[PDB]
Amino acid sequence: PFFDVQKRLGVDLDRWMTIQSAEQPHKIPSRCHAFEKEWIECAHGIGSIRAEKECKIEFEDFRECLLRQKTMKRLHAIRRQREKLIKEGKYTPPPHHS
Amino acid sequence: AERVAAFLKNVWAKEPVLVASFAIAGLAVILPTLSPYTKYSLMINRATPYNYPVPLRDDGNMPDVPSHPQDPQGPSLEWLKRL
Amino acid sequence: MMLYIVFILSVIFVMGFVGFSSKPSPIYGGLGLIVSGGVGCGIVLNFGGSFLGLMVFLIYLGGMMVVFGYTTAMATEQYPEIWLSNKAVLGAFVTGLLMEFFMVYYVLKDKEVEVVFEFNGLGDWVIYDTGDSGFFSEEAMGIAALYSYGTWLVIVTGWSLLIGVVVIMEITRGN
Amino acid sequence: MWFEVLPGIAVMGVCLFIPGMATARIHRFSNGGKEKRVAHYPYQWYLMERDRRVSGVNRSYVSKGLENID
Amino acid sequence: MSMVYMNIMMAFTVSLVGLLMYRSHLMSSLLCLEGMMLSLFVMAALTILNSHFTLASMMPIILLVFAACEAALGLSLLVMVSNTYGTDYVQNLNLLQC
Amino acid sequence: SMMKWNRERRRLQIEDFEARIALMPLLQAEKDRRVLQMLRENLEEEATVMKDVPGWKVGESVFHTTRWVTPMMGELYGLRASEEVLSATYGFIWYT
Amino acid sequence: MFMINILMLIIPILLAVAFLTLVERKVLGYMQLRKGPNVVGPYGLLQPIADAIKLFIKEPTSSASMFILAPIMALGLALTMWIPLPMPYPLINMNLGVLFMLAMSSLAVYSILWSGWASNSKYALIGALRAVAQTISYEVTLAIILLSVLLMSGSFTLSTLITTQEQMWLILPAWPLAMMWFISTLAETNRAPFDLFMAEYANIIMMNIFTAILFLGTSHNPHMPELYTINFTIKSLLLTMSFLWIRASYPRFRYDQLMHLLWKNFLPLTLALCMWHVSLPILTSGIPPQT
Amino acid sequence: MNLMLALLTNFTLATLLVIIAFWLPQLNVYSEKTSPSARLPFSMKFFLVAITFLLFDLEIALLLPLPWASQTANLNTMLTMALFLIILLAVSLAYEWTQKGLEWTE
Amino acid sequence: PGIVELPSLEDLKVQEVKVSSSVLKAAAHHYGAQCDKPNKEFMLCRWEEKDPRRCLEEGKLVNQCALEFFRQIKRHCAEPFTEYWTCIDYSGLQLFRRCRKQQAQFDECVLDKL
Amino acid sequence: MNPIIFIIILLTIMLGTIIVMISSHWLLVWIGFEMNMLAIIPIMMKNHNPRATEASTKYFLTQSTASMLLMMAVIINLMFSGQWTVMKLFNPMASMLMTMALAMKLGMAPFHFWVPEVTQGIPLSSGLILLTWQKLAPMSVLYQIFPSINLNLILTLSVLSILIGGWGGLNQTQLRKIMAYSSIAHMGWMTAVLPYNPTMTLLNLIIYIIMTSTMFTMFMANSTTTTLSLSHTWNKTPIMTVLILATLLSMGGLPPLSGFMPKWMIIQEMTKNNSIILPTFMAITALLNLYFYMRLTYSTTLTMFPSTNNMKMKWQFPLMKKMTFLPTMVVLSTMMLPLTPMLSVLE
Numbered sequence A: 001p002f003f004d005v006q007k008r009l010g011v012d013l014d015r016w017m018t019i020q021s022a023e024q025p026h027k028i029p030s031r032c033h034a035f036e037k038e039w040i041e042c043a044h045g046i047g048s049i050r051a052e053k054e055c056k057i058e059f060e061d062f063r064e065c066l067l068r069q070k071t072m073k074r075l076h077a078i079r080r081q082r083e084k085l086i087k088e089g090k091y092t093p094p095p096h097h098s
Numbered sequence B: 001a002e003r004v005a006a007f008l009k010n011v012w013a014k015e016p017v018l019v020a021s022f023a024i025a026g027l028a029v030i031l032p033t034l035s036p037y038t039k040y041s042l043m044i045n046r047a048t049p050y051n052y053p054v055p056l057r058d059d060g061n062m063p064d065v066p067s068h069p070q071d072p073q074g075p076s077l078e079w080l081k082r083l
Numbered sequence C: 001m002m003l004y005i006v007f008i009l010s011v012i013f014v015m016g017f018v019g020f021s022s023k024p025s026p027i028y029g030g031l032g033l034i035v036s037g038g039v040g041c042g043i044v045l046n047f048g049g050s051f052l053g054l055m056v057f058l059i060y061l062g063g064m065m066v067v068f069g070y071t072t073a074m075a076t077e078q079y080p081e082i083w084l085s086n087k088a089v090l091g092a093f094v095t096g097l098l099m100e101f102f103m104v105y106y107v108l109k110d111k112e113v114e115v116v117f118e119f120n121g122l123g124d125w126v127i128y129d130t131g132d133s134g135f136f137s138e139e140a141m142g143i144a145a146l147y148s149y150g151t152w153l154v155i156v157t158g159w160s161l162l163i164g165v166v167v168i169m170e171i172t173r174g175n
Numbered sequence D: 001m002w003f004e005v006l007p008g009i010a011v012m013g014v015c016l017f018i019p020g021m022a023t024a025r026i027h028r029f030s031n032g033g034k035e036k037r038v039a040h041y042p043y044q045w046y047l048m049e050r051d052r053r054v055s056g057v058n059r060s061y062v063s064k065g066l067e068n069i070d
Numbered sequence E: 001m002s003m004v005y006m007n008i009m010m011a012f013t014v015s016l017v018g019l020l021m022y023r024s025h026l027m028s029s030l031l032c033l034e035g036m037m038l039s040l041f042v043m044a045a046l047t048i049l050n051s052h053f054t055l056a057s058m059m060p061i062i063l064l065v066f067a068a069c070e071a072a073l074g075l076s077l078l079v080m081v082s083n084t085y086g087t088d089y090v091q092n093l094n095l096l097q098c
Numbered sequence F: 001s002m003m004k005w006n007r008e009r010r011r012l013q014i015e016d017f018e019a020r021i022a023l024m025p026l027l028q029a030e031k032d033r034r035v036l037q038m039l040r041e042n043l044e045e046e047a048t049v050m051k052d053v054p055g056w057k058v059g060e061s062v063f064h065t066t067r068w069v070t071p072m073m074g075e076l077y078g079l080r081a082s083e084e085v086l087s088a089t090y091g092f093i094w095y096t
Numbered sequence G: 001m002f003m004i005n006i007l008m009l010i011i012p013i014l015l016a017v018a019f020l021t022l023v024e025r026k027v028l029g030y031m032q033l034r035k036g037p038n039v040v041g042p043y044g045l046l047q048p049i050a051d052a053i054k055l056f057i058k059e060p061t062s063s064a065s066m067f068i069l070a071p072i073m074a075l076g077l078a079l080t081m082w083i084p085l086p087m088p089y090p091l092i093n094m095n096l097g098v099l100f101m102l103a104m105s106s107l108a109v110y111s112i113l114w115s116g117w118a119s120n121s122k123y124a125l126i127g128a129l130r131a132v133a134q135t136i137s138y139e140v141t142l143a144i145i146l147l148s149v150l151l152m153s154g155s156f157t158l159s160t161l162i163t164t165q166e167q168m169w170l171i172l173p174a175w176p177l178a179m180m181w182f183i184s185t186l187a188e189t190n191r192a193p194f195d196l197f198m199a200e201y202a203n204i205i206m207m208n209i210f211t212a213i214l215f216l217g218t219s220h221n222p223h224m225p226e227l228y229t230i231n232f233t234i235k236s237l238l239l240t241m242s243f244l245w246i247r248a249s250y251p252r253f254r255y256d257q258l259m260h261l262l263w264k265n266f267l268p269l270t271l272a273l274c275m276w277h278v279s280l281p282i283l284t285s286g287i288p289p290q291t
Numbered sequence H: 001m002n003l004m005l006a007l008l009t010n011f012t013l014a015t016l017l018v019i020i021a022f023w024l025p026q027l028n029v030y031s032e033k034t035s036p037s038a039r040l041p042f043s044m045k046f047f048l049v050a051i052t053f054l055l056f057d058l059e060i061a062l063l064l065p066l067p068w069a070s071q072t073a074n075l076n077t078m079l080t081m082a083l084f085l086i087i088l089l090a091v092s093l094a095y096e097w098t099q100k101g102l103e104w105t106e
Numbered sequence I: 001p002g003i004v005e006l007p008s009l010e011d012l013k014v015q016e017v018k019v020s021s022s023v024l025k026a027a028a029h030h031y032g033a034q035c036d037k038p039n040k041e042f043m044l045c046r047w048e049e050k051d052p053r054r055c056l057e058e059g060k061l062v063n064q065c066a067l068e069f070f071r072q073i074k075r076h077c078a079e080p081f082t083e084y085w086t087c088i089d090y091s092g093l094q095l096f097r098r099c100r101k102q103q104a105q106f107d108e109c110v111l112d113k114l
Numbered sequence J: 001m002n003p004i005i006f007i008i009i010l011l012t013i014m015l016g017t018i019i020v021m022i023s024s025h026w027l028l029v030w031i032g033f034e035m036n037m038l039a040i041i042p043i044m045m046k047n048h049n050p051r052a053t054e055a056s057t058k059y060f061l062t063q064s065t066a067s068m069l070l071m072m073a074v075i076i077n078l079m080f081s082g083q084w085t086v087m088k089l090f091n092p093m094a095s096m097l098m099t100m101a102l103a104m105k106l107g108m109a110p111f112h113f114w115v116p117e118v119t120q121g122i123p124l125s126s127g128l129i130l131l132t133w134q135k136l137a138p139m140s141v142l143y144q145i146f147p148s149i150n151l152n153l154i155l156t157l158s159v160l161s162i163l164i165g166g167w168g169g170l171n172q173t174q175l176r177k178i179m180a181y182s183s184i185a186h187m188g189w190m191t192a193v194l195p196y197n198p199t200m201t202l203l204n205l206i207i208y209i210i211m212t213s214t215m216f217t218m219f220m221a222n223s224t225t226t227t228l229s230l231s232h233t234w235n236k237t238p239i240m241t242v243l244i245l246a247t248l249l250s251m252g253g254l255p256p257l258s259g260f261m262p263k264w265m266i267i268q269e270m271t272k273n274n275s276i277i278l279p280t281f282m283a284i285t286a287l288l289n290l291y292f293y294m295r296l297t298y299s300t301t302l303t304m305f306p307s308t309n310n311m312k313m314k315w316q317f318p319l320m321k322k323m324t325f326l327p328t329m330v331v332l333s334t335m336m337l338p339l340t341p342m343l344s345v346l347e
């Protein structure tokens, strides 16, 4: 904040909703809770310039949980390859998976 | 006083609908503070278990934590049944 | 085909946006926004947002868009124009639908397209969660937290709505 | 007389009665003669989805009891 | 990112271009300003709901209240413009060129 | 009267919730065995389908951490009938 | 099997609305010391059939599309309002059934706007804008009243109103709300003294069915569901008959007076009672269960 | 699926009953009948009534979660914020009332 | 990155509790007082370890205690239990308050025979 | 307006700005902008004429567009970081959108076209709020997101603003048009130095506000809104022409007046980072501003334009306008250079 009134007065106006690892109703966790927990704890106190290089691994993991780009790429490759073999009749799904 | 009972008696005659609304809204704001049962509302909300009650690892110095759900230790809902 | 209901719903979402964005008479403009608003609620419903989706019907469609059509009827032409009868209105409609159709083609064919962001066309269900059996609605618990957690949100939101009434009475008085 | 108005009311009364009566009878016809299971929350859906697997016929309204224990 | 995001981002862009490319009726532009809000509501609700960020569940509602409050102000201005000229044409609002 | 009845309903809900709490361990245990079994099944067909792809490692994570990550719907039902995926994905949302 | 269920709901509704027209004309007649239809079929029982046939073979705009959309929207949305009604089992069991009905009811105001717009008459349009202003004004008290009632119920589920009233009808704890609710429904359906046809009369029945559920809850026995339906039907019929009764006995409001009836009497009182009903469960320790 | 089927039936049946009602009459083939700026004008009162509805409707959306809000352990805060929202809903009306926003005399 | 470790199908096998949800609901209160020890150890494992793989043995004892529990009933109290969960199964909400008589018969049965 | 309502509306204008300044959450930043815009539309219409309505509509459309882009940038940031903290943004597209949203809200070129027109269309008191108080909230956001702002974008806007503002003012005879273009040109200095030292962006904001308030206050005292009506001032209040000369020379950046101080400190901060070309170009281009300020002093203080006979009747009456803080404001606008090191209080 430009003026950090909340810390001075010790009153919380909006920090409760800034992150998703914070206290939630009925202790309901967010899907990326553990990934955001690590990145915040890694990056805490060292500054954003440092945290851009010394918490890079944690932030990549959190960004993978958030948007799941790499998981979808790996799933498309398997789907692409699988259907090809079905096109050429080399492979047949087991009893399950069908 | 009596300058006021004549004011109230005038609105009761000319605007009964508003006198009722301002009477009900005052009761709504005031009664919750003066009621002896407002505490039971907090307790009953606090007594409803939405989540699983995760057990505590028994290090060896937790005398008041029960070892079994039916043990005497721990909070009880006895007040809730009578209430 | 029902496995891509969220993608199919979002395609109609865009077409309805091309509808009123091309800007026909403000009466078909409001009809396209109603269809998109309803289709937009459908998307939110399928993600678990029952209350958020119903707030769209109750507030956005049955409140805001009603007042739009009401205001439009009081101060706008009264006579509409045959949709697409105007050259610019028709030229923008086809342009939008062509880009809407071209994005749909390359994402479904290649299961991926790249426009500013990277988009993956494996389906929307693939990112859904595989774990929940709580005996409550998480949406409802999040919204209900407004009165406990969001004391500050309520105050500023309440003040803005009171001030909206005061402001709107000043604007329209004329002296 | 007033009671000559009843026959029209009787036809309305029957008409508005059918929707509820039909729904209740169809529900029991479609659920082995029991009430249609209500699943407002994920926990109830999860138990309903487990009942479908346990049933052995892929129908959540077929119940299995101690006869499946051993 | 997922596939549905492609179209919700496509709809925001469409209504942004529709907003910035005027025609004549000032009403037709306010609807583009409300299509933008509708797209941002849906984009936010999908993000918040999918990630299970419970306390953010009220963000779309607040965003819907404030934007509608804005539209109420916008319609009021349109009505006052209509009084002065009998039409909501944007080409009648050119007094301040000099 | 409303107060007496609503108190009685809160007590019934507490009992209703408590029956769930007693059963959650047994449902949690079976959920774990179904998730792992589905993941193990997918890994087998992954090995066969991706055997001939150069540079592929079967079962490789996309995360730097070796912590357990809950799989997403795509990872679990990524190679199954559209009826089972549809029921697992939208079944609850479309019920009644 | 579901398709039969939806048909077994729509067709009785249309038949019920057709014969509501008969009941209206005979009930008004007898209150006026006459008879009403008793010539077309015995006791007039064929009068609705005669009216229907004649109407559809009678000889029959600014916007062709809107002149077609207006009847569909009103007719489609009037039928949709019935799908969540627990009678005792809903056709579609919704967790937010009450919220669904407020939403759909709100869209009903569009048909009024579109029909007035498509007319092509400046005079016709302003008449529609007056009707739209009456409706949305009185939608405010319906929503607030309904919210005050749901604080004693505990959820938005419509079948939970059955359970809420297991011991006692909500009319006793909420008769001041039931009064303003009942008048608001008349204004919402633009019925006398607030009248300043199939879809219209379907809403009238549905709003009175919803009133019986909200304030006169019928006990439901799962082993004999048909008894609930009979008692439920009787309560809604009499509530519908009271609409006819009210129409016969009163003159009409002026437009500014019915706006004043809400903005200056119902809303001030409806707001206060909303405050009262938020506080009362907390101070009495009678908050209902969330599920 | 059930809801989508129900909505489709309701609005399909409405559509059928509307088109045939537009076409069954042309069976008769009745004889041809020879029947050969942008403000209504509009009154500012019919605009204010709609806008006041909108702003009150927005403040209603804020109250809709009230049935769920009563289930929290922080009931003192919930009750204080609920009565705050309704009171300012009354304050808005009292401002409308005292500044003749709710009149119909011109 | 490394290879996601997964236990083989042989390790994931165990004798299931193949009773419907209304059967579990009817025994849930007694079940939670009889099988509490193995149940709570498994849940402490899950919350502590945050990994379904690290608690696969504890989860097998949950089934073992559950299967044994349902045999205790099948040996002494089958009919009162069958009559009870058949009443629960009728309700759409599986409500407890609708079957207080049959619940009673089941309670004296177990409180005498077990 | 009823005076009580006017005060409440002003405090809502201030409340919205403060909400943006004290918020650590992006939604509360958006809300503060939305609340702020809502309350300022009233004071723009308060005289009720077609010009005041055109200004309010052009303002509403511009600000509303900016807020939807700001919200869009906030949601993109949420998608890519899963958090709402007001700090650096975690996506370059989010940064481009936010920077353009704030640029539109400030009236920076090329998003500048509304500033001259909206300012000319409202009263002097309303224009003072538009060109002074309204800069605080967008500026305090740029202050916190600057580590992720695209340098070519922020520097491109700043240079464009210094050129557009300087050239646009040369062709103006309306005092409200002159002030608007002066505002655009001065915004260009504040954002040029932001990537290098955000403290010198606050220094230039404070001093620009103090001198802009002094100008508007002096225009309001005699109700002068055109160049030629201001040229009568010498024949009513000769003191006011001297203060107007001094303030205008200060705004031009001429030493030893206070307005030289911000330009001095920015050139120092830019050269420390080996930016030599840009500050040289910027400083030379600012000579355009000095020219059409100097023109104003010629017709006001340094010559005596022809007067009117009816001006004789004004001599018999005193000024009754409040002119609040004008004596203090004019002395901060002209005599503050010796205390330049005191800028560290803003660190």
Ligand SMILES: CCCCCCCCCCCCCCCCCC(=O)OC[C@H](COP(=O)(O)OCCN)OC(=O)CCCCCCCCCCCCCCCCC
Pocket (backbone or CB within 6 Å): B011, B015, B018, B019, B021, B022, B023, B024, B025, B026, B027, G267, G268, G269, G271, G272, H087, H090, H091, H093, H094, H097, H098
């Ligand atoms: C009191 C608390 C303790 C309770 C214990 C019991 C004691 C009860 C004592 C209550 C006394 C309240 C007296 C208030 C009287 C109302 C003021 C009044 O006289 O208003 C009259 C005036 C009439 O208006 P009008 O008819 O149009 O013009 C005259 C034409 N002959 O109308 C007006 O001047 C305009 C006023 C309109 C605003 C009033 C209604 C408020 C808005 C609705 C919300 C109602 C709930 C109250 C909210 C306030 C916070 C609680």
Ligand SMILES: CCCCCCCCCCCCCCCCCC(=O)OC[C@H](COP(=O)(O)OCCN)OC(=O)CCCCCCCCCCCCCCCCC
Pocket (backbone or CB within 6 Å): J237, J238, J239, J241, J242, J243, J245, J246, J249, J256, J257, J301, J302, J330, J331, J334, J335, J336, J337, J338
């Ligand atoms: C502090 C450290 C930094 C140092 C830099 C220097 C700072 C100085 C500027 C700070 C602000 C102070 C302003 C000084 C105001 C002087 C006013 C004055 O002396 O009287 C003006 C004169 C009076 O007119 P009248 O109303 O008729 O009164 C007659 C008495 N019966 O009015 C007239 O008679 C009309 C005058 C005709 C116009 C003459 C124009 C030349 C004025 C030169 C003074 C202004 C110079 C400002 C630039 C700074 C110079 C270095």
